Amino acid sequence: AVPYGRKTQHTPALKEVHILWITAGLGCDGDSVSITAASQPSVEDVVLGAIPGLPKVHLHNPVLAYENGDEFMAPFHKAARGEIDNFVLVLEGSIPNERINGEGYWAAMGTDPQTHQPITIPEWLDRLAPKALAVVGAGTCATYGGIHAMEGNPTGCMGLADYLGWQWKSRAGLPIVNVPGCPVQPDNFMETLLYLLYQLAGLAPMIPLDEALRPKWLFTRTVHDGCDRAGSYEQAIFATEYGNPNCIVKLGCWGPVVQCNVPKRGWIAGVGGCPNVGGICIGCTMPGFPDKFMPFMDAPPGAVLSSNLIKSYGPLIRSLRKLTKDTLNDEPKWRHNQPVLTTGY
């Protein structure tokens, strides 16, 4: 009864995988909420294993989980002991500085019966991190510290690299995987997770990351490289007020120097965006975010130099486009309802 063609069905190198999702870092749960917007692939696509041949995925995420309280945490505590040999660690939110304390906590999950003492995020990390197949950073907070690692913050928090080391490799040789963004672009994360499910199954090579440990195929090109308002930039036409359809670099957009794919990719099903729809890029996917971008609605100094640049040839190269567009908005002479044919036949 075993149908010919099942021979195309090859068992994954890793039969199953556990995804331990810590949302109790310093942050909102925006990256968890965001990924439920994905379609390429969707989050139910991944759990129900819509794409065959990949490891069976077990998703342990507080926001969606069926288990509750102490039973939800049970898989977390088990892995800590070394009982689990197939879990990837996902952090969402930044890592608090607990050394500046103290007899308290900035962030925590799992009150523990060991002493009736809440575990801190730093304890969880170097408890699970060195036993994991891979550690994933979900959101600019967990990757680089983000908005909460702002100048003047009380917690003195940081990203996963700050805490573990930028050269830190997992027990399976996988460097820290950083998927930045605030929040993470839905498809971006699901593309990266899917890539990891492929790599672990044996069907793909080591995930190509960059120096900041970002997925190359998502974060190499800059925002400006994919912005459709870039025409009006070349032609020296810059928006005077928000809402205008032209380039908004003088209005706050850091797009020319930020590594993000949103304008090119869209936010949800091609719909959303930032500067391509009149929202200035505030550089939310960068390590320097947000301090190296504020005040947001001010022009980037670099833009000021390049904006003020005199492109003399501008208005006449803008002329032949006009002149050429006019010859192209008129039909050839042989299109008429006259008694004789004049096409050339």
Binding site: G27, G30, L64, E71, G243, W267, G272, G278
Partner: protein, 559 residues
């Protein structure tokens, strides 16, 4: 018996519920709610440019951030003394309406729904499952589910037909949202003085086209949930008691009228009224205020049970409002957050969540006003006002009339939400579904107004402004989970003080100095135990159904 669950899942943020429950009498003696995350927005916001507020405050939460951005942009509008073009606030309303439609739908049928699904009911009340199979749903004609037991199975996570469907519904409602505000949850096109969204006939075409699909979906979902909730009222007579409290409801208004709103503190009384979700404190079955200035001044943040040192010896910044009124010290405008990290102890200090209360001028009481969800608080206030006349939404006094015109496959529908007589867990969840129809209804009206502005040719979307060297500002806006305020202070052209107070902060708060319980506590205390299990295997679904009714959101709660 000491039964506690921490962290509580299928909510946003890390929450913990510790309790003392009397099994022998089926009662909950005490209760104590606690968060575990502090980020300190009020702290690092100080000294920053005011123009950065809505971008930063949006990150307060990953599910309702657009509400803070909106609420923040409201306040800067006040401070900078600027009124954005009329079409810009229609656009912002269309965006926020989609935010309601998205959030309540994802939360109702994917987070709180799991509490009602087969798998849970067959782990909590194996008897109720047996009962459920033979109950035919009163509205199977509208939602195609023959029995309540079928509906329940349709909610099993990832396998349930309706579970999987609402995920889809949360995507195109977010698409809608993104058409108006750029991206979700943190907006990209929102600014003080207007928006960056380009108004075209396409923009409103792509929104209306998706809206109509959400409208028809609600014709199915309203009856679908009434039947499931009416069931528990019939299945377990008295269950109404679970998660109930005195009618202590807050509603600080929602969608706004560019015809009237100029964003001045003085005229804030007036255009406070004409908001398409009438603001007001309801207490209790009775309605006190038509005025936000009225309700604004009466807000006090208490500290009986929180990890802060209190700002007794910290300098005030605002003594009077822009209209001469007196301003309190424990009011957010004059608040100073001193974070005090310390060991947990439910005797006195056990939560990062402050204890906001309200002040009744009539009685000198500082009651723990709640939102309930808070689509429940919202609907209650508007029904009484009898002030909103939108057609799609109409207020009589005894109720509010939600009308959804004929779609492609169904005819007209009207949903009259009558005052529930009770403020319980189920009626909250019942309210959440009804407000989705409210949003869809309201959104239909805003689309009209917007298109007029567009056809008239008035397509400017931004009005220029200047940042004052000395100013104050208040933002009032109903978030998804209820009342949301943003109090801003500007000194030396910088943010001197900024405190956002979402709905959760109230609901999750502990008891004030006066010792009045935290809005969960009172609701989770008065909560009976209709459960069918004893402590040993007992997972305590009835308390969870109570906390989740409030639609908790701990990032908003501590910020």
């Amino acid at each position: 018996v000491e039964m506690n669950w921490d962290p509580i899942t299928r909510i946003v943020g890390s929450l913990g519920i510790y309790t003392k429950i009397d099994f022998e009498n089926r009662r909950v003696a005490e209760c104590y709610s606690t968060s575990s995350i502090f980020r300190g927005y009020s702290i690092f916001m100080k000294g920053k440019d005011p123009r950065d507020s809505h971008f930063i405050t949006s990150r307060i939460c990953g599910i309702c951030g657009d509400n803070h951005a909106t609420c923040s942009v409201y306040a800067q509008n006040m401070a900078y003394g600027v009124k954005p073009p009329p079409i810009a606030d229609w656009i912002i309303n269309l965006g926020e309406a989609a935010e309601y439609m998205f959030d309540h739908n994802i939360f109702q049928d994917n987070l709180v729904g799991v509490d009602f699904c087969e798998q849970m009911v067959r782990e909590t009340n194996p008897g109720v499952w047996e009962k459920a199979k033979t109950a035919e749903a009163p509205h199977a004609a509208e939602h195609g589910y023959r029995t309540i037991a079928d509906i329940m199975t349709a909610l099993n996570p990832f396998t349930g037909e309706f579970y999987r469907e609402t995920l889809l519904v949360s995507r195109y409602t977010r698409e809608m949202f993104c058409l108006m505000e750029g991206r979700h949850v943190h907006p990209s096109t929102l600014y003080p003085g207007g928006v960056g969204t380009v108004p075209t006939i396409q923009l409103f075409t792509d929104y209306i086209t998706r809206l109509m699909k959400y409208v028809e979906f609600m014709k199915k979902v309203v009856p679908l949930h009434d039947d499931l909730f009416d069931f528990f009222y019939e299945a377990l007579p008295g269950y109404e008691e679970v998660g109930r409290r005195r009618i202590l409801l807050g509603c600080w208004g929602s969608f706004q009228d560019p015809n009237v709103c100029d964003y001045n503190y003085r005229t804030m009384t007036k255009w406070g009224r004409g908001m398409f979700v009438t603001p007001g404190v309801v207490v209790d079955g009775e309605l006190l205020t038509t005025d936000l200035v009225d309700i604004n001044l009466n807000i006090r943040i208490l500290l009986g049970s929180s990890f802060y040192q209190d700002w007794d010896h910290e300098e005030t910044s605002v003594k009077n409002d822009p209209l001469g009124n007196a301003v309190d010290r424990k009011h957010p405008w004059n608040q100073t957050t001193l974070p005090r990290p310390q060991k947990r102890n439910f005797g006195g200090n056990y939560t990062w969540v402050m204890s906001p209360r309200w002040l009744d001028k009539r009685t000198g009481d500082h009651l723990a006003l709640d939102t309930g969800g808070g689509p429940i608080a919202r609907l209650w206030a508007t029904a009484l006002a009898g002030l909103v006349d939108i057609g799609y939404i109409k207020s009589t006094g005894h109720s509010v009339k939600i009308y959804l015109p004929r779609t492609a496959l169904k005819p007209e529908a009207e949903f009259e939400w009558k005052i529930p007589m009770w403020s319980n867990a189920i009626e909250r969840d019942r309210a959440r579904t009804y407000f989705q129809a409210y949003s869809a209804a309201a959104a239909l009206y805003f689309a009209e107004q917007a298109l007029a502005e567009l056809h008239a040719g008035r397509t400017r979307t931004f009005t220029d402004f200047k940042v004052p060297d000395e100013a104050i500002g208040c933002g009032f806006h109903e978030a998804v989970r209820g009342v949301l305020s943003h109090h801003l202070v500007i000194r030396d052209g910088k943010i001197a003080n900024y405190h956002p107070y979402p709905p959760t902060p109230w609901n999750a708060s502990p008891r004030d100095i006066y010792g009045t319980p935290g809005p969960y506590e009172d609701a989770v205390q008065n909560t009976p135990i209709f459960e069918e299990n004893g402590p040993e295997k007992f997972k305590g679904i009835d308390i969870m159904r109570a906390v989740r009714s409030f639609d908790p959101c701990l990032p908003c709660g501590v910020h």
